[PDB]
Write a protein that binds this DNA or RNA. Structure first.
Length: 42
RNA sequence: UGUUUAUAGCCCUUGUUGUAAUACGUCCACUGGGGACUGAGGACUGCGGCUUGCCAAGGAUGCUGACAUAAUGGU
């Protein structure tokens, strides 16, 4: 099959059960809101 | 000074509004937030929920950025 296999039987990680679910933003950050930038260049 | 709701009212008992409210106690296998520390394990098995796939259910993954530097780290 492949060429130059590693001399170590690879350790596959255990199947994680972390499912990505949609972020629930703050109830006060509706579109059209005026906001204040705290960090960054602005 | 003396009296008995009058041109203020109060105290006691009962009825009512009443299945009154609140406080306190207790409980919810009811629920909304904010912060902190930790991520041990390493294919598959298990117990469960959902609808075979999915799942927060036998231990962290995902999306990114900066720097790739003495920056982290050590002496």
């Amino acid at each position: 099959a492949a060429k130059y296999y590693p001399a170590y039987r690879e350790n596959v990680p255990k199947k994680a059960r972390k499912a990505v679910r949609p972020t629930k933003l703050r109830a006060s950050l509706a579109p059209g809101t005026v906001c204040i930038l705290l960090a960054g260049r602005f």
